[PDB]
Structure formats: C-alpha cells, structure tokens
Design a protein around this ligand. Structure first.
Ligand SMILES: NC(=O)c1cc2c(NC(=O)[C@@]34C[C@@H]5C[C@@H](C[C@@](N)(C5)C3)C4)cccc2[nH]1
Length: 228
C-alpha cells in the first residue's frame, strides 16, 4: 500500500494473506467459512510450492491469539483467466477445513447485485504489499481509503486506454494506491466487498494509471458454482 497507514489490528477480520512457501504473496478475502477469494495471477508459476492462507493476522511474523495458518484443499483459478491479460483475474481457495470464526476472523458480505459503485465512493483497500519505491515490505497490515474512479475517465488514452471492461472497476491512484503484494486483496465499499485488486504488475501511486479491481458482482454465478 503506498501513501497509507497501519491498519487497526483485527479491524478487518476478512483480511487474508495468501502465502507461498511461508512468504506473503498476495492479499485475499474470506468470503465463506471455507473459501478465500484472491487474484488468479497469484497462483501462476506457484505449481509445486506450498500455498497457505493466514487468517486473523495483523503482524505477519509475531504470535497473535487469532492468527491461524490454513492449508489449501483446492486452488480454483477462473477458467477464462490468462497469463497475459487482466481479465477474469479471480482465484478461489478452499481451506483444508472451515475457518474458526470469531471477532478477528469473519467472512465479508460480498456484492451480488451487478450495478456499478458510484464514482467518488470512498472504498477501503488493505494489504501487506510494498510501501515505497525501494520495495520495503511492512510486517503489519496497511490500508488506504480510495475514491472510485468512473470507467470512462479510466478508459481515456492518457489512462488505461479502453482496457477497462464492464467487469472491471477503477479507483484513484494519486499518491495513495495499492502496490506489489496487494494483488488479490479486497476493495470494500460501505462494508461490502466490491472488488479484488488485479494481480497484473502496474505502476503504483501514479494518477495517470488508476488502480484496477475486478468487480465481484460480475462473477457472482462463477463464485457460487465453485463453492457448490
Ligand atoms: N495491483 C497492484 O497494484 C500492483 C501489482 C504489482 C506488481 N506485481 C504483483 O504484485 C504480483 C501479483 C501476483 C503475485 C506476485 C507475482 C505476480 N506475477 C502475480 C505479480 C506479485 C508489481 C509491481 C507493482 C504492482 N502493483
């Protein structure tokens, strides 16, 4: 997270750290008792490596009573996702068992109505991604409040030049932004999950290249199919 601040410990009980061989790789969001939603590019080239999900965490390294590392039974990338595209960039992770719920571990209600979030809506994005241009990794969860950017501005030649489909959404990136390692994390608007940070490498903190987030409402039927 660039231009953000340390999040209040355990105030986002849905927050997941998707890890490969014990290292934070991507953000994630607990969407059901046994299911964590993330971005599909996260799992690319992971084939062999041990994928796990850390729930109830604030610090990645320190012991916390609510902190629990879960093994993964199944990794389900969207069938239409592709290495060289930003489309259908969603990944569903089935934990080895249903998560132990409590004040620091709870699924987040997610948007099923396929209508756009209003431009200007202040949304929350959290993560353990880099915090500066040098690549400094924070030990504890960071967050930033970002206003949603209308699709037409986001689609200008100066910005993302027509790459923003109706299944994608944008947020402003003026100094405050998601960055490397925030990929797959949640964009929460009015206490409801609206987007998943895309996992395509993108410049961070540049106003002319807004944040791109996959709209969960656009994939409601796919998320339901997988969980079933
Ligand atoms: N979303 C953003 O804001 C944003 C992402 C990003 C980035 N790249 C990643 O974060 C990942 C995401 C997953 C897991 C890891 C390998 C990878 N190929 C797939 C790329 C790291 C690099 C530089 C700036 C960036 N900015």
């Amino acid at each position: 997270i660039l231009g953000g601040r340390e999040a209040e410990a355990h105030a986002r009980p849905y927050m997941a750290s998707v890890q490969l061989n014990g290292a934070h790789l991507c953000g994630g969001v607990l969407v059901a008792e046994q299911w964590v939603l993330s971005a599909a590019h996260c799992l690319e080239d992971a084939a062999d490596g041990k994928v796990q999900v850390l729930l109830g965490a604030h610090s990645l390294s320190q012991p916390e009573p609510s902190k629990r590392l879960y093994d993964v039974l199944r990794a389900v990338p969207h069938p239409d996702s592709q290495p060289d595209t930003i489309d259908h960039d969603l990944l569903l992770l089935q934990l080895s068992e249903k998560a132990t719920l409590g004040p620091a571990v709870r699924p987040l209600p997610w948007q099923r109505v396929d209508r756009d979030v209003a431009p200007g809506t202040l949304c929350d994005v959290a993560g353990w991604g880099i915090v500066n241009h040098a690549g400094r990794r924070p030990d504890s969860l960071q967050h930033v409040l970002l206003p949603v950017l209308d699709r037409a501005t986001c689609n200008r030649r100066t910005h993302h030049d027509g790459a923003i489909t109706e299944r994608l959404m944008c947020a402003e990136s003026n100094r405050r932004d998601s960055c490397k390692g925030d990929s797959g994390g949640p964009l929460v608007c009015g206490g409801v999950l609206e987007g998943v940070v895309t996992s395509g490498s993108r410049v961070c903190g540049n106003r002319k290249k807004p944040g791109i987030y996959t709209r969960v409402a656009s994939y409601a039927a796919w998320i339901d199919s997988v969980l079933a």
